[PDB]
């Protein structure tokens, strides 16, 4: 009960790159929980200041067809931002992958995971942003967002 951690998952649904994932939710059926943190507009809100190991896995998955009059190269990027007592969001972590360039490519499977420790104040907000949101697979075992006090 005095444990400070969170792991949230979803289901399909400004000043930051990409688009903010806001379809996260807390439910035991999707293996998600909140303990001394809460969820609001897709952001995890910090209660206790300290060092947090923050992480996210975003599953890019598509069954593409080389769309004629279109370049097909995809930049799949996951951004982890924090809103602190500053007007603009501050980027903490970013991880990227480019899709295979071959014309023979029939589909793509790109699970991106990153994590790191960042000091967070009380009432700081952390969120995940991604490019190509329409290719994200929101199955709870595939895409998630979490954090835990590491000091």
């Amino acid at each position: 009960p005095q444990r400070v951690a969170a792991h949230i998952t979803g289901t399909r649904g400004e000043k930051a790159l990409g688009r903010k994932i806001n379809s996260w939710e807390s439910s035991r059926s999707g293996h998600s929980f909140l303990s001394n943190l809460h969820l609001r507009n897709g952001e995890l809100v910090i209660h206790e200041k300290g060092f947090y190991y923050i992480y996210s896995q975003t599953y890019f998955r598509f069954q593409e067809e080389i769309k004629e009059n279109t370049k097909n190269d995809k930049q799949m990027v996951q951004y982890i931002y924090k809103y602190t007592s500053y007007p603009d969001p501050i980027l903490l972590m970013k991880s990227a992958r480019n899709s295979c360039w071959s014309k023979d490519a029939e589909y793509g499977l790109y699970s991106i995971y990153q994590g790191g420790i960042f000091e967070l104040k009380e009432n700081d907000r952390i969120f995940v942003s991604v490019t190509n949101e329409h290719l994200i697979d929101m199955d709870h075992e595939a895409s998630f967002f979490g954090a835990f006090l590491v000091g």
Partner: protein, 110 residues
């Protein structure tokens, strides 16, 4: 020199003690709002393939643009992409390349 209401003005950050507003270093870092940050934000650095449309000042972060021949869009903020040089068969170029878009190709009738 002095923090108004616990905040320092754009182009500065507050000191550890909270009694001084230290200027951001021109060309190195910046801050665009009144803040209580213990540091100015690092200026972005245009990667080659991008031309610096405007320098980083003490209050404004540097603005980069894709180099001639390449473009960028919302879903591709990480790397400028090469503009296609031609269109598919049965199609003709009707629009050029820009730093924000690829050539435009329509279908030919005649």
């Amino acid at each position: 020199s002095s923090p108004s209401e616990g905040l320092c003005p754009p182009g500065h950050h507050i000191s550890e003690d909270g009694r001084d507003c230290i200027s951001c270093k021109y060309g190195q870092d910046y801050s665009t709002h009144w803040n209580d940050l213990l540091f100015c934000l690092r200026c972005t650095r245009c990667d080659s393939g991008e031309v610096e449309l405007s320098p980083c000042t003490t209050t404004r972060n540097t603005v980069c643009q894709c180099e001639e021949g390449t473009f960028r869009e919302e879903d591709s903020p990480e790397m400028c992409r090469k503009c296609r040089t031609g269109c598919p068969r049965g199609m003709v170029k009707v629009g050029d390349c820009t730093p924000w878009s690829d050539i435009e190709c329509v279908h030919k009738e005649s």
